[PDB]
Paper text:
The crystal structure of GDP tubulin indicates that the T5 loop fluctuates between two conformations (“in” and “out”). For WT(GDP) tubulin incapable of nucleation, such oligomers composed <2% of the total. The GDP oligomers were found to be more curved than the GTP oligomers for both WT and Y222F (mean ± SD, 34.4 ± 12.2 and 22.0 ± 11.8 µm−1 for WT and Y222F, respectively; Mann–Whitney U test, P < 0.01 in both WT and Y222F pairs).
Numbering used by the authors:
A (entry chain E): 4 to 31, 44 to 145
B (entry chain B): 1 to 280, 283 to 432
C (entry chain A): 1 to 38, 44 to 438
D (entry chain C): 1 to 37, 46 to 280, 284 to 439
E (entry chain D): 1 to 280, 283 to 431
């Protein structure tokens, strides 16, 4: 029932006032440099993480190059070993075949030596029969 | 965030990629010559996300087609929309990768990669605001898996601030091309965990099972599998291609879907499931129910076996937005135990008036579920069974690889599984 | 002269800006081309400057880190109302990431925005300060706005800064990380804002469904309603009113302590335009509606708090006798609990200018309306809900890598959260005895 | 592009080469003069300015008789005289003469001609070497050639089509010696070797073609069909293609385990209804259709490549393979989760006019890596041991510069190979 | 491996050698003037193995005729086909060797050997691809045995990489020319074991017994014995003279037939057994059965008494290849015990359409049997019986020989027997 109306303002398209039902029980700098500092620190963290990503990708490219080179090195070692094993085999075989033919011809030469000795022995009986 | 640059690598990548361009071209009113003959401004509003405007009123896909063999490229050129592609964007070698990740990644692929980068650089340089890259490829072969992951690493080095998105086809013995698929896949997953922002796991095991069990195809072909993939790809890219509020670009999608950097492998879901020949209902309540159905997942995992970290649900066709909102709330309330409590409001919904080609109504789910660990476990078991006996390893070490790379790739993928399991068991009282 | 410069940031700020300036033009008889066929008030010059061609141009700046939304303003119905220079856009948005808006992308466009603001300030003979419209949830609305507020405090030391901030709601939200953005922006903005009027998208959404019979409200529906509330608050600056006649008076009448500067807005009546001819609501009916939580701009229960100040802003066919009679009956039936140190009472203002509605809109034209602005400790409920969502995610560090990747330190999350914990404690302490 | 160089060594290699190149010409529409009134055929044929299509092949023999038939035959204009290389005296069924004594006098000439063919290749895939295990040239000259090819071409792919000896048609008692010696020497230089058992082909000709006493002409025409099936994936562009690298990767789990078993179907008499994809695929797992006599039921599969040709669609292949995957009797090793690789080509099997084989709508050649093929090594090693225990005929090799240590080393390597097949078949 | 150079030494050598040229000339369509008048391309396909092409369209045997006495060479010149031979290829002395190995090997033969080498070098040097040499001679006389083995050693020295093949006639008391034949034979075997790659053992004991028992010739002449030899020689050289796969040259035959270097003495077998110009055919089964028949062996050994190390079987005439293959498999299956188990697939078969002169069908067997030790044992016993008493030893020591040569030759031949016995008893274990 005890309502206190206090007039505040009056104007051309308005009217205002305050209505008090009960009074109160208890009576009663950012800087541009600081902002810039924070944005630049965030930009540096973004830049740093992107650089670390690209550094990791660069290490992948290095690995890719090492695997191509490894395949090439394995192929070259295969060729080299195949070449030396084959040269060893062909030379060892040539030495063996030559040895086998030298041994056979030496046996035949000994037969020829023996035949001349047989003919010589015959001459000490033939004609030499008084 | 306007232009996306699309790359498709290897046989699988080019086959699903060609089907993607056919579907979205039909949806956007683009014919095989590149001419717009549609009757809706919604079709052209965001057409520059995937298409460049060329001489006359023609639209040319911002697509780069890659292979280490010319065969696949010729087949795409002769295919239905083969003439729409920019002829200079076909980049191909002659040697092939011999189903060998090491050949695609280190030897043959390395010899072709700079020619591909030149084409993708030309496309990227002409973008007013490049979003990033979208790669379609398989993980079981040599080119898509090995050369595709090599491309991702090279693209990351030149465009470290752009989004890298992949549609990665996971191998299955159910429909296999080579014996070394588990090796190729594990080596690729190792690359994807580190170098992609978002990867859609398109599992051939799941695609086969949908065709066999649901569609009753006794003997599914790659064409039957690719009809599911093209529909899924249309659904997951709806928000990028048409005007909308939610996940309208590759980065905003990644911010909503990826709570931890390594956990970026999505389980796509789609309803209704149809065959190419079944051009024969589906209510809003029924469409929403398929979110928890293993039979609707394009990754062979059961969503009831884990928990959703995040979900993006996309409804297409003429339907009540109010009914969609009501059913989406009901699905979360009725399935509380399948969503992590420590990511509030982790399910975002979008509705587009334009339905996918051949359908009147549809729903696509992009889920980041901890159940995806089942896919990685399956690959890991197949990998271990071979690696334990070092079977076929000489074909990889012969390319210069070390056995330590295999151990490391396997270890990283086993760590990925543990990480999913850790968050699956995590409670809101950490 | 007492000029006010309006700053609209991000999609929410820009789209709400469109609704506000459309309404101001209708209220002042300004056409979309800036022409005004003009008795009379003259007070509209606080919000509109005049050109040599006789065109009235808003003292406003529209800023977004992406051009799509502002492009609709550049080519829309009101393209002649604004000069190209006041519509500022970047190329790439903040991707719902406060760190991206504040530290990475925002940093490239701040100086351009401040230059344009300076050019508007130069045209003022008695600048009051700024009215900043933005969302809590977007990367630009959160990140760019806090960066802008900091520089405005450097360049305009004394000058008042009032906010109209959109509090996030799941029914219309576009990002899981909105709680992060909301806390981060509140922490950085807190000491730079003098008074902030929060609008909870859920409260507006429910008022549109309940009172306007809109099945699924769109941003257009929400923004037209928000514009009515903004217009009610700014009416006394744009017409020769008697209460809140300058920006400093908002702080004088509503803000007893610097940190507790978030008044609760209540508006009535909200009636459907398609309502089968209703008999006009009385001063008693619209005044009773001020004390109903269903009409609040933020979801909270004033029963669970104490009032520190209450401003009743009436518009239209209203006489003091009817206001006093209405307040007298409310006090008799209800406990309008004020804190011990403040008097239990109301400052009442009547602006004779009628409530204006957009032709063809959802709101019905009424003979009288009221907007109550009350500084209640109940609004801390909104902070508690937001802080809880923040804590659930932050306990696991979910999505934190997105912020750290943009150069923000993990420690800023703890600092911002600790500041909001102190704010919740302040609301508790102020409401004590 | 993607060129393959064929090398035909000794009588068996040359005569099989005649049958192959005759068939390739018929399949590609190339006349015996080289004129041709797809494009993939360029992998096997180069082109001259005059429009002549010339085989990327070298025919080598240490005696001139067999290659002389090529020089004066129907296809004498097909090959330039330079690619038909012959000496004067053969290796007399002696590995030592083919490898050392006689072979060393003609290796440089052969390598020079191969280098000239390789110079005409922009993307050389590898070499296909055709030879017998039993002849002195087929065993000894082939081993020497393979070693020299590893020197000049490093790891460039080298695939073999090797004739495994059979008593019904063999010409030498020492064929087991020559077989083990060449296998030991060649093992580390070959990436993949397709063995053809003469007894298996002989029995297929008697059973399926009703030939009372098959001749080399009968055997070689059938072999020519199997070789064509294997190489059709490189000479045509079909629905699914398999290159030399893909054969290697998919068939060879370990370097030494590189001997796939070849199975072919259908083999039907030109007298004598069309067999479905399921029927011809099922026939691949029947021992009666194998190129090597062995029992896959006594072993495990490690890999299976199916090469189809003719009226075949992927859907029918997948249905056929799915039913094969369910067969309990067809056992794979536990370390092979995925064992199939399929290739499909549209050109139906071409048959030589006046031949024994009937023209069919579809055919298939399966290449499988089975531990059962170790049975072939066991039979050969046993014959080797019987003679070597007494040193029978060893003097012929020693006389030519070889040492008994080479016999023991070669035999020990084959013992390790038999052990490898046993180890690889074991469960983990 | 094209040309073969043929040498025939001494009486026996020139007599069987002339008969060989008559038979193969008839088979190849060559008349006594050297002109081809046949009607089959098969006859000329490999004619150059034994014949040179001379002025006109004539074919001249690549044959050298040798003897230390002019007699047999005059008889060859006057015989049928005597005019076919190159006149300059007749090399002969006047002195004779007196059926004494020492005279042929060391004295008279040594005086004529260079004149022979002149002629064989001329023939060999004109060969595009010389296979080797083929010598026909007896072991019991002096020229064929002594000078023939001297020629082998001289030829080997000049052509160490060529094949040395002999048709060696073994002596028998049943049809003997001298008392010292066991000495001449043992001394020759000693040379053959060391210097030949393949030797066909043509035993006069076996030839006599076939003529006496089978052909019922009460008193056989060398003409009757030589009809069996000419037929055998035609059969064993079939694969060298006509197009074929198996044993097509002297080296490939040796690689298939000789498992140990010293064991190169072959037991030739032939069916059917006929007398001169007498027309009487056997079935393929009957022809195959003769492989194990002692009555069909040209060496007086029983194949059932030992084991076959290796066998080359040659069927001639119009017959079913399938039937031949079936019967040959049946003979090895039914007679497993008579083949060494440690030489797998040791029986190789060839079929030629052209039958030998005067026959419609025939089979020739070239066997490397351990039963051949019976032939060497017989010679060795005859040798020992004489040498134990040093009988006639001055006939050799008078020519300059030492008794140690006799001991060595005997020892080597006894070692040869022990070696055959060792492999006969060897098991696969
Ligand atoms: N009331 C209302 N809320 C809006 C409007 N547009 C967006 N919002 C809300 O604002 C939040 C998203 O912030 P936005 O303003 O769209 O984003 P932004 O400021 O442009 O920032 P970025 O696009 O992330 O750079 C969500 O809670 C939206 O529901 C609008 O016009 N009205
Ligand atoms: N399939 C088949 N096998 C053959 C053919 N020719 C020979 N053989 C076999 O190969 C082996 C003999 O080797 P060849 O190829 O004839 O001899 P080579 O390589 O010419 O060696 P030499 O003549 O001894 O220098 C035996 O097993 C024969 O059956 C043929 O045309 N086809
Ligand atoms: N869904 C699907 N998978 C395919 C397709 N083509 C191949 N694949 C799969 O891709 C893998 C083989 O890789 P592929 O792309 O053909 O090899 P690349 O050319 O070396 O990339 C296997 O898992 C195949 O099942 C296709 O069109 N659709
Ligand atoms: N089969 C056969 N044996 C003969 C012939 N002439 C001689 N012999 C045998 O040869 C041996 C005598 O050697 P011979 O050749 O006459 O003496 P040479 O002139 O010194 O060689 C004895 O064993 C004779 O029986 C012949 O024409 N045929
Ligand atoms: Mg925005
Ligand atoms: Mg040969």
């Amino acid at each position: 029932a005890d309502m206190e109306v206090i007039e505040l303002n009056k104007a051309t398209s308005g009217q205002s006032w305050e209505v008090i039902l009960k009074p109160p029980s208890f009576d009663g700098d950012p800087s541009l440099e600081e902002i810039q500092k924070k944005l630049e620190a965030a930009e540096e963290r973004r830049k740093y993480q992107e650089a670390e990503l690209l550094k990791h990708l660069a290490e992948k490219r290095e690995h890719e190059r090492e695997v191509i080179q490894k395949a090439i090195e394995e192929n070259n070692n295969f060729i080299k070993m195949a070449k030396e094993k084959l040269a060893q085999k062909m030379e060892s075989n040539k030495e063996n075949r030559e040895a086998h033919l030298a041994a056979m011809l030496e046996r035949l030469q000994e037969k020829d030596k023996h035949a001349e000795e047989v003919r010589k022995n015959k001459e000490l009986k033939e004609e030499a029969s008084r | 965030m306007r232009e996306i640059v699309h790359i498709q690598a290897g046989q699988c990548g080019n086959q699903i990629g060609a089907k993607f361009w056919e579907i979205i071209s039909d949806e956007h009113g683009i014919d095989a010559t590149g001419a717009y003959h549609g009757d809706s401004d919604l079709q052209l509003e965001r057409i520059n996300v995937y298409y460049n405007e060329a001489s006359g009123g023609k639209y040319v896909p911002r697509a780069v087609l890659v292979d280490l063999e010319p065969g696949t490229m010729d087949s795409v050129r002769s295919g239905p929309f083969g003439q729409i592609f920019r002829p200079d964007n076909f980049v191909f070698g002659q040697s092939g990768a011999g189903n060998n990740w090491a050949k695609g990644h280190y030897t043959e692929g390395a010899e072709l990669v700079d020619s591909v980068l030149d084409v993708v650089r030309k496309e990227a340089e002409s973008c007013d605001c490049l979003q990033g890259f979208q790669l379609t490829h398989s993980l079981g072969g040599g080119t898509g898996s090995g050369m595709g992951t090599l491309l991702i690493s090279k693209i990351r080095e030149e465009y470290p601030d752009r989004i890298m998105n992949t549609y990665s086809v996971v191998p299955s013995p159910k429909v296999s091309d080579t014996v070394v698929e588990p090796y190729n896949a594990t080596l690729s997953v190792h690359q994807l965990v580190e170098n992609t922002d978002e990867t859609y796991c398109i599992d051939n095991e799941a695609l086969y099972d949908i065709c066999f069990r649901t569609l009753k195809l006794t003997t599914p072909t790659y064409g039957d599998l690719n009809h599911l993939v093209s529909l899924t790809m249309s659904g997951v890219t709806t928000c990028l291609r048409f005007p909308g509020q939610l996940n309208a670009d590759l980065r905003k999608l990644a911010v909503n879907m990826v709570p931890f950097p390594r956990l970026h492998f999505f389980m796509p879901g789609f309803a209704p499931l149809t065959s190419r020949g079944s051009q024969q209902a589906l209510t809003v309540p029924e469409l929403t129910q398929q979110m928890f159905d293993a039979k609707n997942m394009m990754a062979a995992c059961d969503p009831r076996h884990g928990r959703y970290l995040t979900v993006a649900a996309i409804f297409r066709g003429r339907m009540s937005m109010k009914e969609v909102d009501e059913q989406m709330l009901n699905i979360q309330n009725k399935n509380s135990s399948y969503f992590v409590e420590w990511i509030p409001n982790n399910v975002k919904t979008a509705v587009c008036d334009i339905p996918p080609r051949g359908l009147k109504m549809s729903a696509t789910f992009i889920g980041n579920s901890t159940a995806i660990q089942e896919l990685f476990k399956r690959i890991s078991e197949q990998f271990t069974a071979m690696f334990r006996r070092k079977a076929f390893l000489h074909w990889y070490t012969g390319e210069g690889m070390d056995e330590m790379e295999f151990t490391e790739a396997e270890s990283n993928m086993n760590d990925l599984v543990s990480e999913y399991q850790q968050y699956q068991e995590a409670t809101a009282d950490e | 002269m007492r000029e006010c410069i309006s700053i609209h940031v991000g999609q929410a700020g820009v789209q709400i800006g469109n609704a506000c300036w459309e309404l101001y033009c209708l209220e002042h008889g300004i056409q979309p081309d800036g022409q005004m066929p003009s008795g009379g008030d003259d007070s509209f010059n606080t919000f509109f400057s005049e050109t040599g061609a006789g065109k009235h141009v808003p003292r406003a700046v529209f800023v977004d880190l992406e051009p799509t939304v502002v492009d609709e303003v550049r080519t829309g119905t009101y393209r002649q109302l604004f000069h190209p220079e006041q519509l500022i856009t970047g190329k790439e948005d903040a991707a719902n990431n406060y760190a991206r808006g504040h530290y990475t992308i925002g940093k490239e466009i701040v100086d351009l925005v401040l230059d344009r603001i300076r050019k508007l300030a130069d045209q003022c003979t008695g600048l009051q300060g700024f009215l900043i419209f933005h969302s809590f949830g977007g990367g630009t609305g959160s990140g760019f706005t806090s960066l802008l507020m900091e520089r405005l405090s450097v360049d305009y030391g004394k000058k008042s800064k009032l906010e109209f901030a959109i509090y996030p709601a799941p029914q219309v939200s576009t990002a899981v990380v909105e709680p992060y953005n909301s806390i981060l922006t509140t922490h950085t903005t807190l000491e730079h804002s003098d008074c902030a009027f929060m609008v909870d998208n859920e409260a507006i959404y429910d008022i549109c469904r309940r009172n306007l019979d809109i099945e699924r409200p769109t941003y257009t529906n929400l923004n037209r309603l928000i514009g009515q509330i903004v217009s009610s608050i700014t009416a006394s600056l744009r017409f020769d009113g008697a209460l809140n006649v300058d920006l400093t008076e908002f702080q004088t009448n509503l803000v007893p302590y610097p940190r507790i500067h978030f008044p609760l807005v209540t508006y009535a009546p909200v009636i459907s335009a398609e309502k089968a001819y209703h008999e006009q609501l009385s001063v008693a009916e619209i005044t009773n509606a001020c004390f109903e939580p269903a009409n609040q701009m933020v979801k909270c229960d004033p029963r669970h708090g104490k009032y520190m100040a209450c401003c009743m802003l009436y518009r239209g066919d209203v006489v003091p006798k009817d206001v006093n009679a209405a307040i007298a009956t409310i006090k008799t039936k209800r406990t309008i609990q004020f804190v011990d140190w403040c008097p239990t009472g109301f400052k009442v203002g009547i602006n004779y200018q009628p409530p204006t509605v957009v032709p063809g809109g959802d709101l019905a034209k009424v003979q009288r309306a009221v907007c109550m602005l009350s500084n209640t400790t109940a609004i801390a409920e909104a902070w508690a809900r937001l802080d809880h969502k923040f804590d659930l995610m932050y306990a696991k560090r979910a999505f934190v890598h997105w912020y750290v990747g943009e150069g923000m330190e993990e420690g800023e999350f703890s600092e911002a959260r600790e500041d909001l914990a102190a704010l919740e404690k302040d609301y508790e302490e102020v409401g004590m005895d």
